[model samples]
Target: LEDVVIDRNLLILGKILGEGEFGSVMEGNLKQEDGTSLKVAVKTMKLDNSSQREIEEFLSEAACMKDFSHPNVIRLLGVCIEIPKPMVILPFMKYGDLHTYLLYSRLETGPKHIPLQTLLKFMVDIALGMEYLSNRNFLHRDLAARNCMLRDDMTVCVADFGLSKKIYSGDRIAKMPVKWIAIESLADRVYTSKSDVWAFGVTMWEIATRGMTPYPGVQNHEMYDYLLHGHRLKQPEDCLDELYEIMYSCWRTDPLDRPTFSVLRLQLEKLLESLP
Candidate 1:
């Protein structure tokens, strides 16, 4: 666990790569043993409202990530806590995130004509990553398309631990991703592997629609009531019925009714094999 700590002097921060609601990522270079430098993405958050316990919990999660060996899960290189707020070190991918890639696929000058096959592959990658985590008793509370990354070869890997805490402390309810949350979780704030499945379903919709927002015209405050009415994300345009069915199963009101990540992954693989 001590190995996960990185020396601040060995890191060099670069330009801002991207910014999020709670934190910002910057391109960084870390001095290596062979007199070389490795490019990495450094994630930092504001710790003004955080307590010592909260900071420890956050770093512990990142440390746990260091031992994860799945190809579809992003690897945590180290944590740099020399600054006011600790920085999470991760391998930097040129393609950035899956959601941004999907959005870019819609533009004329961006990566054009992303086939349905590729999109399905992205879904499989995420499913596999989640399956690995769930198998190890880990719940990715924030399993959305934006939280998944795209490798240089376009492989989608689950990333980000913003809400992966086993037991959340403080008033984080308002900061949660409402649309991607499970109906039951939205109601009671109890997250589990099943809740992650629900978020995965929403992520699938995001992929199918090329990054369109879920629950079009629905406000975050209205998600609980909207779901209580038994409404779900409608099938995206041109999405296959089989694919829709697989995702819809994840949104079952009863958590016990939701398919496990392993089952979902197998279904996706079978579907991909059947595609022309």
Candidate 2:
């Protein structure tokens, strides 16, 4: 395989940030050519020996990461796949991922109560980010609270592109992130922009309930038939009547019946505007 563009000599790893099945993220500093050091969050594969096939896959992902530039999307800093465990560097988010932050606020003596407007704004940020990605034919197949990160000032950016897919004419898949997927995606292995909207609806429920797991007693095996009969997540107690309405729209059985990201953006905007 070919070497990636990152300079390993100046790559210094700091504290551990997050961990997942495929990789672990860490705080790091990448020395720049101009004698400046940039803080970054580094994601590295955990495998001891990466195969050639994995190298090719990571390289293709790196190319996509470099091509993206948006405020609501986590911009890629650089990549290092030459190493045994391929590494991906990105700008660090001080507040960390939205899921953990939301859960933290719910602790017995947790941080100050997060304002209702702030929660609404988080939805707006995510909608705007997904709208941009949708415009470019990118499907965030795994849009969930855990996959979205928060900047220092609490701005949300849709993160975790590992399961993302291109918007091809025919949308078929072998496996899916079940908890956050649509009925069509599970039953037909077909995914589209609207499938992402379904995941976004579930994510809204996560934010409202401070990161509670979706489908309380229902297992993945049960979720399929559950939704098959028109069941969806119950509205959060504190959630507004109109906001829940938007979420229900995303869960429509027919893809055509679901609202697009643009429509959701406008809907979220109106919800925020209504705040005094």
Candidate 3:
């Protein structure tokens, strides 16, 4: 591995932000030549230790992010491919990930109790973003609370494209994000735009419940077997019946029967509009 000189004037890498099996993300500040501050989230791929497949996956994610642009989706500021540790700069979110928000809200009298309308609004924003991606022929293989970013003004943005895939043909199948996947996806390992719709349904449930664990007591490997054999997560307590109905529809046995994101956006908008 050789150290390639990257333009440090554009991206100033700082402390580690977070890490995963594939690589580590750093909290950095993007700067202009004059040193003006532009806080950014830097995700670096460990090329040395990374396998060929892992590098390919990282590149795929980068390719997808590079071409995508939506208000609800995180913006990719820049990239440093020349460095030994190739990295990407993304706009930082002040409120952090959705999982943190869920945990905080779950606490007794914690700062996390969001009004039903507020939560619904966040979910709708995410759905709108996913809808945009789906229209662009992209499948966000991973669509969970953890991948969502909440801004200070309560606006939501969908992040983490590393697990995303591009759908080229109707016959081509995308991989499922097991935890948030629909039944047919688990069986075939074949995900589609519709499958992403199913995952969004689950994400809506997560928002409504303020971040309760999905299928609380069930194990991951066991989920596919259970769901494939006709099992599904029952609606959480206090969840509106209409909401559960929407979720079940998304989880339908036939993928073709699932609603498109445009339909989903309209339904969610109506739900929000109808709420007090």
Candidate 4:
């Protein structure tokens, strides 16, 4: 393999894996003295003509990821700050992302449906990761299938913390666009741990249904009205009643009424255990 230089010290090993609003993530191998193979993901932040706010957000994401450490969360390997453009190094996930798997699996299998046992395992892994975030007093504001990575063993790790917030005060109410917002989140932007649970409900729905887009016919602002008026995404055909009920509980109108991650985890564990 040729030594690809991202900077004076860092090297880029391969081509891009993905790209987003932030920048492109390249698959790379970081250099080490012992000749040990270390796979790393290099996220190159777009700097040219980037607004100050955009730059700040990019830097903030790097700062947050640097301090984060959890088995169920993606690891930040290192960062290259010496160059004109900043780059963040993260662990390279081999199995791609949950969204890709969901879509491809559905198409390849021709609607046969994913096994409930597989879904339960995925949910449990997500819960474990979210529980770790809760323990750290951080709220993963954006917890969706698109933000998750699936490993070869079907285990999951929560990725992309750019939208995350550190909950300083108790819940405070603010209005949010209802498109992806849970019912309570739309009414009051007060995202407590409970609000995250609300998002998890929608995410669970996405996973069970093989990546069906949430609120299919509903538009952005209309989602608030629809949900407030007692409408939710209809259950998938293969969804178990028990799992659907748990999802509904998480989407409750009252944020305070939502179960804690710990509580939700326990309920899911029980549900899975009782399954044949």
User: How do the predictions measure up, each by TM-score?
Assistant: 0.90, 0.89, 0.84, 0.82
Each model's lDDT comes to 0.85, 0.83, 0.75, 0.73
Candidate 3 lDDT over 1-276, as tens digits, reads: 112222656676778878987588888887755757778888776676446665565566666576677888888765776434677778777679987887887788656578878877887899889888887777777788888998767789987643445444344253335678777666764667888888888888877777777788889879878887777778888777877787778888898998988888888789889999
Candidate 4, poorest ten consecutive residues by summed lDDT = 1-10
Clashing pairs in 1: none
lDDT tens per residue, model 1, 63-166:
77888899999998888876367788888898888888888889988898799899999999999999888888776777888889998888899976433535
lDDT of 2 by residue, 2-85 (tens): 334587777899999768787788999999779899899998875444577666677777877777877889988778753476
Between candidates 2 and 3, name the one with more favorable lDDT: 2
Give the RMSD in angstroms, all C-alphas superposed, for model 1: 2.6
Order the candidate numbers by lDDT, best to worst.
Answer: 1, 2, 3, 4
- How many backbone collisions does model 4 have? 1
Candidate 2 residues lying further than 4 Å off, grouped into runs, are 1-4, 46-57, 162-177
Model 4, residue 148: what's the lDDT? 87
lDDT of the structure predicted as candidate 3: 0.75
Top-scoring candidate (lDDT) = 1
Q: Which lDDT value does model 2 have at 195?
A: 87
The Cα error of candidate 4 at residue 127, in Å, is 0.9
Write model 4 residue lDDT over 92-148, tens digit each, in one string: 778777877778876755434568888887788788888888877677777788888
